[PDB]
Amino acid sequence: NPLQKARILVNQLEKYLDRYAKEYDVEHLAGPQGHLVMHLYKHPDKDMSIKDAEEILHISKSVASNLVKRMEKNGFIAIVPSKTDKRVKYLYLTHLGKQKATQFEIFLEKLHSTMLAGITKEEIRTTKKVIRTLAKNMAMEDFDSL
């Protein structure tokens, strides 16, 4: 069975990703936390309220609320209410969050360099075409994926 063969692989690869992240001290920056950190970092001119965060990650209000409170717990951001309207919550990347941001870019660079060692942009493009076609063949009517 290739199903079970495939699941087991992704799980093992997730294991590797996680250890790699520990090693770079950019744990907890795997998924959505890292996305918000890199958003904040790259656009310091602009602000992000929690409402902006929901839209930027396409997540629900309660989920967003849990995320940012986790990020705050981690010390990556400060949550400061709009001085003009204290129902609006702004997120600001801390010193620690900016450190994590620069660490995260490094990590992502080395991770891809390691993972994609010995593999061409062509090979990848093929890979993507195959997966997407499979997905198409099997889903039929249900083809509403990523």
> For binding to a second copy (CB under 8 A), which residues are involved?
1, 3-10, 12-14, 16-17, 30-31, 114-119, 123-124, 126-127, 129-131, 133-139, 145-146
Nearer to ligand HEM, 96 or 115 (CB): 115
Least spacing, CB of residue 44 vs a second copy, in Å: 25
116 binds ligand HEM (CB under 6 A): yes
Angstrom distances, CA of residue 97 to CA of 45, 62, 136: 16, 22, 40
**Which does residue 135 touch among a second copy, ligand HEM, none (CB within 5 to 8 A, set by kind)?**
a second copy
Judged by CB, which is closer to ligand HEM: 85, or 142?
Answer: 142
**Minimum distance from CB of 71 to ligand HEM (Å)?**
16
Whether residue 121 is annotated as binding a ligand: the answer is: yes
Choose the binding region for ligand HEM from 49-57, 81-89, 93-101, 108-116 (rule: CB under 6 A): 108-116
SS (H, E, C) 100-137: HHHHHHHHHHHHHHHHCCCCCHHHHHHHHHHHHHHHHH
* 51 marked as part of a ligand binding site: no
Selection from a second copy, ligand HEM, none that 118 binds (CB < 5 to 8 A by kind) is a second copy
Quote helix, strand, coil % in the chain, to nearest 5.
Answer: 65, 10, 25
Q: Count other C-beta atoms under 10 Å from residue 50's C-beta.
A: 17
Q: What is the C-alpha separation between 29 and 86, in angstroms, rounded?
A: 28
Q: State the DSSP code for 45.
A: T
Tokens of 24: 């770079």
